[PDB]
Design a protein around this ligand. Structure first.
Ligand SMILES: *[C@@H]1O[C@H](CO)[C@@H](O[C@@H]2O[C@H](CO)[C@@H](O[C@@H]3O[C@H](CO)[C@@H](O)[C@H](O)[C@@H]3O)[C@H](O)[C@H]2NC(C)=O)[C@H](O)[C@H]1NC(C)=O
Ligand SMILES: *[C@@H]1O[C@H](CO)[C@@H](O[C@@H]2O[C@H](CO)[C@@H](O[C@@H]3O[C@H](CO)[C@@H](O)[C@H](O)[C@@H]3O)[C@H](O)[C@H]2NC(C)=O)[C@H](O)[C@H]1NC(C)=O
Ligand SMILES: *[C@@H]1O[C@H](CO)[C@@H](O[C@@H]2O[C@H](CO)[C@@H](O[C@@H]3O[C@H](CO)[C@@H](O)[C@H](O)[C@@H]3O)[C@H](O)[C@H]2NC(C)=O)[C@H](O)[C@H]1NC(C)=O
Ligand SMILES: *[C@@H]1O[C@H](CO)[C@@H](O[C@@H]2O[C@H](CO)[C@@H](O)[C@H](O)[C@H]2NC(C)=O)[C@H](O)[C@H]1NC(C)=O
Lengths: 103, 43, 53
């Protein structure tokens, strides 16, 4: 998955939505430990930058996205989604990785 | 204990019938007089 | 129309016409059903499970 620098990329991960959901986005640089990005659907902890667009949780029958704007070479990180639905049981494993290949 | 020359006034019959559902069918029996059944045409 | 002096007694408990109202609503309910479909072939063996939740 590749776009030009300074741009926005679109990253999706996992099943279609069923009910009200809470999503969690984690990132991981290669060789290093994992790391948080987005803890609620559109909320991020302090000390973390903006320009990370998440999806609202109210929309039914959609797919969770993740939009990265003003990208750079440091943003080359393996990504991991973690969904929590109010209809499906608890996922004890993480979603599929979507590696970014920056320009 | 029927004498052979006299005939039965009662016949005893069994057959199939639908139950309350549509899939099950059951086997049931009853009595009838001779003036209500006729012969369709071994067995 | 309004009236003066004349005074009558009432009784809600042995009052009539409520009985024919309770008859008439039942009869209207029954008349509103015979042009609609029967559900005879629906009584059948059902294979059931829990919904996804
Ligand atoms: C989906 O269904 C599961 C049922 O397995 C839900 O898991 C339940 O999660 C709650 C979270 O509060 C657990 O409650 C905790 O229980 C301990 C027991 O002492 C209590 O001390 C804690 O304060 C807390 O209340 C609950 O145990 C757990 N169920 C089982 C069987 O372990 C889950 O929340 C449901 N929803 C989702 C979105 O997954
Ligand atoms: C004609 O009518 C006779 C009686 O007038 C019916 O015969 C009866 O059919 C039942 C079928 O369940 C028999 O019951 C069985 O009896 C044995 C005897 O020990 C028992 O071990 C079984 O567990 C069961 O209870 C009953 O015996 C039988 N009557 C006689 C006198 O044998 C019959 O259904 C009718 N239809 C025909 C013959 O097509
Ligand atoms: C009432 O329903 C029962 C059950 O559905 C009927 O029994 C079925 O009767 C037919 C003809 O009598 C049987 O066909 C025969 O099969 C045997 C071996 O399978 C074969 O040797 C014969 O040549 C003939 O093809 C059938 O198998 C039998 N089914 C069962 C489950 O017993 C019965 O005929 C119905 N009517 C009455 C009046 O009892
Ligand atoms: C039921 O009753 C009839 C009537 O009696 C029996 O029919 C007889 O059958 C035998 C042999 O087929 C004849 O010799 C008799 O003349 C018949 N009787 C009449 C009045 O015609 C029949 O056999 C009986 N069945 C059973 C099982 O008892």
């Amino acid at each position: 998955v590749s776009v030009a620098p300074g741009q926005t990329a679109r990253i999706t991960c996992g099943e279609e939505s069923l009910g009200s959901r809470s999503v969690i986005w984690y990132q991981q640089r290669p060789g290093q430990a994992p790391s948080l990005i987005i803890y609620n659907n559109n909320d991020r902890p302090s000390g973390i930058p903006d320009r990370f667009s998440g999806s609202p949780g109210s929309t039914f029958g959609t797919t969770a996205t993740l939009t990265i704007t003003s990208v750079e070479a440091g943003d080359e990180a393996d990504y991991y989604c973690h969904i929590w639905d109010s209809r499906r049981p608890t996922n004890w494993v993480f979603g599929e990785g979507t590696t970014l290949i920056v320009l | 204990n029927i004498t052979d020359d006299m005939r039965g006034e009662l016949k005893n019959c069994s057959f199939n019938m639908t139950t309350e559902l549509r899939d099950k069918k059951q086997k049931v029996y009853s009595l009838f007089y001779r003036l209500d059944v006729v012969q369709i045409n071994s067995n | 129309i309004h009236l003066e002096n004349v005074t009558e007694e009432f009784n809600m408990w042995k009052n009539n016409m409520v009985e024919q109202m309770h008859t008439d609503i039942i009869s209207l309910w029954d008349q509103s059903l015979k042009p609609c479909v029967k559900l005879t072939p629906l009584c059948v063996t059902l294979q059931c499970t829990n919904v996804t939740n």
